[PDB]
């Protein structure tokens, strides 16, 4: 038997008002239960939630950002969806309206009366001010943005703005006595609709509202045309025309709750039913997405198909997305820094081992490449999708993912084939390493059929290196998903600490990071992949050819395999035979795409560029290489970049993840995820949609 009530908080009184009905009505059907908590406004409302008293409630982009933060830390459980022409979406165009004829356009905005939905809201501020910013006569954050804005225009009415110190900004407002400039319904002109009025009534000459404002208000095609629409091309365009005309695009409004014990579960069901039982067009009793004539969008935006549950993992930053995220910091960050933050790179590291390395690179490159590391690799990706990163090397195994999260491949990795070896590589098309299986000269009582439940050595879960290919085969070999029981004891980082799969790991010296997919744990990756059956803890190992050769026979000083033999271990061919490590090529599971760098679509080129320089500085023939740092060098461990890799090269007419990895590798890995499902991916799936 579930829980109590969802104390949804409120801005205006009218807000508390219309809410109540909701409350009432609800009971009539007997589903969930709420309780409209009376309070100041959204902003304040936020705090209320972060101080038990409240929880559920919708917030505009701009807010959300502010929402999930230092002391509040609140995450959007669900975003509301809107149709309105086109198809159901969960994002919207940020635009600028005005009255027909006027004369100015985007840039000429200076010296006029504006209109803003509310101070802060992405819609009527963040983007607006942001896009205009360039020409403004302001520097960095210390000196309030308000001021800047304030005396850029002639005047205006920015609800939440401060009239105290600031004049104009709260001038054009229509608020009655002291009800003027209220960050809630009270002061009229607050909201998308209201703000529209601001211009309609002549006070303001330009309004910055939603891609579907007017429409809502002005039905009769007639009047409607009386106003035009501003497009960043420094010209005007028809109202309905916001596809190529619009300042920006932002994520839809979404209800936010607490990070932990914020009653997530509850909330969902609450809206869930309510948005079906009394959502849009349903019973007459109450109208969910429909506020009174008075003020519009109350509780939730006015007219919006319904809402959709945001995936557990999606966090503030994440949801808003980089695009937004980044042009929503300049307003709190100086002008100088911006530039810096732009041109320059931030590599994402995995495991402190790497972290340390990463660090080095900074000072050497003179900070040009700054750093930021995460725990799991997946964790690193996020950050890039969040923008806190910039880009990082990557296994193809996950490259799939990254791609699916939008980012794409930049340059790739070029090993070293002993032929006409030297510098060519830079453009020399990368072949790709090969998937093979290694056992011992001893235990020859094993074939690719005999395997069953031996001692599986995996570099890590869901990776080109090992896991992926074989596992694929295991599903093409057998139609069963359970790879857990399939093999008795093993070590495949990224899996359950108490699973047959992860099992056999060994953490650190002081037995720390155990099963942890990263440097620390000594059983993750290539190097560690051998240390499995090498010291005899593991059995058949899953690595590429070279692996063996980069340790056995004096190719690694570390205790364990400082003298093992190459001829010792064997490959476990497909038909069922065997081969030596020396003789690879024929006895090869398959060809594996090379690892590579990846970034945010837009942040490509530059990145690449920068990288080349650095690659020109301390790489294979890199002049300053051993004199300071050898980019690719990672004390026989393969940190950030591999170790064999001699250079970074482009992609022969293939920049999609479908193209780089090829339709074969690709379609397959999907099939492998049909069982084991990823959250990050899952996220992206909703996010990218």
Curated annotation (Swiss-Prot):
Protein name: Lactotransferrin
Residues reported in the UniProt entry to bind Fe(3+) 2: 395, 433, 526, 595
Gene3D superfamilies recorded: Periplasmic binding protein-like II (3.40.190.10)
Organism: Equus caballus (Horse)
SUPFAM superfamilies in alphabetical order: Periplasmic binding protein-like II
Annotated hydrogencarbonate 1 binding sites: 117, 121, 123-124
E.C. designation(s): 3.4.21.-
GO CC list: early endosome; extracellular space; plasma membrane; recycling endosome; specific granule
Sugar-bearing residue positions: 137, 281, 476
Catalytic residues identified in the record: 73, 259 (nucleophile)
SS bond partners: 9-45, 19-36, 115-198, 157-173, 160-183, 170-181, 231-245, 348-380, 358-371, 405-684, 425-647, 457-532, 481-675, 491-505, 502-515, 573-587, 625-630
């Amino acid at each position: 038997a579930p829980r109590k009530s969802v104390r949804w908080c409120t801005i205006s009184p009218a807000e508390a008002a219309k809410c109540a009905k909701f409350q009432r009505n609800m009971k009539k059907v007997r589903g969930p239960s709420v309780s409209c908590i009376r309070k100041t406004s959204s902003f304040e409302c936020i705090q209320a939630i972060a101080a038990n008293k409240a929880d559920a409630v919708t917030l505009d982009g701009g807010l959300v950002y502010e929402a999930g933060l230092h002391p509040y830390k609140l995450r959007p459980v669900a975003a509301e969806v809107y149709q309105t022409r086109g198809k159901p979406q969960t994002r919207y165009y940020a635009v600028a309206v005005v009255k027909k004829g006027s004369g100015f356009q985007l840039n000429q905005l200076q010296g006029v009366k504006s209109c803003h939905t509310g101070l802060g809201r992405s819609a009527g501020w963040n983007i607006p001010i942001g896009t205009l910013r360039p020409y403004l006569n302001w520097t960095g954050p210390p000196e309030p943005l308000q001021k800047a804005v304030a005396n850029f225009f002639s005047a205006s009415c920015v609800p939440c703005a401060d009239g105290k110190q600031y004049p104009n900004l709260c001038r054009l407002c229509a608020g009655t006595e002291a009800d003027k400039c209220a960050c809630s319904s009270q002061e009229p002109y607050f909201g998308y609709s209201g703000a529209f009025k601001c211009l309609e009534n002549g006070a303001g000459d330009v309004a910055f509202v939603k891609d579907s404002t007017v429409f809502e208000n002005l039905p009769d095609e007639a009047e409607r045309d009386k106003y035009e629409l501003l497009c960043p091309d420094n010209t005007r365009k028809p109202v309905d025309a916001f596809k190529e005309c619009h300042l920006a695009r932002v994520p839809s409004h979404a209800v936010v709750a607490r990070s932990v014990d914020g009653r997530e579960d509850l909330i969902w069901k609450l809206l869930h039913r309510a948005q079906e039982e009394f959502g849009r067009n349903k019973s007459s009793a109450f109208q969910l997405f429909g506020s009174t004539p008075g003020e519009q969008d109350l509780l939730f935006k006015d007219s919006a198909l319904g809402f959709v549950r945001i995936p557990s993992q999606i966090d503030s930053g994440l949801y808003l997305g980089a695009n937004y995220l980044t042009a929503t910091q300049n307003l709190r960050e100086t002008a100088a820094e911006v530039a810096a933050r732009r041109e320059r790179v931030v590599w994402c590291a995995v495991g402190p081992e790497e972290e340390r390395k990463c660090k080095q690179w900074s000072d050497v490159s003179n900070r040009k490449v700054a750093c930021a590391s995460a725990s799991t690799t997946e964790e690193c990706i996020a950050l890039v999708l969040k923008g806190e990163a910039d880009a990082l090397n990557l296994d193809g195994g996950f490259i799939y993912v990254a791609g699916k999260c939008g980012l794409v491949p930049v340059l790739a990795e070029n090993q070293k084939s002993q032929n006409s070896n030297a510098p060519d590589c830079v453009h020399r098309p990368p072949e790709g390493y090969l998937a093979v299986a290694v056992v011992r000269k001893s235990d020859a009582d094993l074939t690719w059929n005999s395997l069953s439940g031996k001692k599986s050595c995996h570099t890590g879960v869901g990776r080109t290196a090992a896991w992926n290919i074989p596992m694929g085969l295991l599903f093409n070999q057998t139609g069963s998903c359970k790879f857990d029981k399939f093999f008795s004891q093993s070590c495949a980082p990224g899996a359950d600490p108490q699973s047959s799969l992860c099992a056999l790991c060994v953490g650190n010296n002081e037995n720390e990071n155990k099963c942890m997919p990263n440097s620390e744990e000594r059983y993750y990756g290539y190097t560690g992949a051998f240390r499995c059956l090498a010291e005899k803890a593991g059995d058949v190992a899953f690595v590429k050819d070279v692996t063996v050769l980069q340790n056995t026979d004096g190719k690694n000083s570390e205790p364990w395999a400082k003298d093992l033999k190459q001829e010792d271990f064997e490959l476990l061919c497909l038909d069922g035979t065997r081969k030596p490590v020396a003789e690879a090529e024929s006895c090869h599971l398959a060809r594996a795409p090379n690892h590579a760098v990846v970034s945010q679509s837009d942040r490509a080129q530059h990145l690449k560029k920068v990288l080349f320089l650095q690659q020109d500085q301390f790489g294979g023939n890199g002049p300053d290489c051993p004199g300071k740092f050898c980019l690719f060098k990672s004390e026989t461990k393969n940190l950030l970049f591999n170790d064999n890799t001699e250079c970074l090269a482009e992609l022969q007419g293939k920049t999609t993840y479908e193209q780089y990895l090829g339709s074969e590798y690709v379609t397959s890995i999907t099939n492998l995820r049909r069982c084991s499902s990823s959250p990050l991916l899952e996220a992206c799936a909703f996010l990218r949609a």
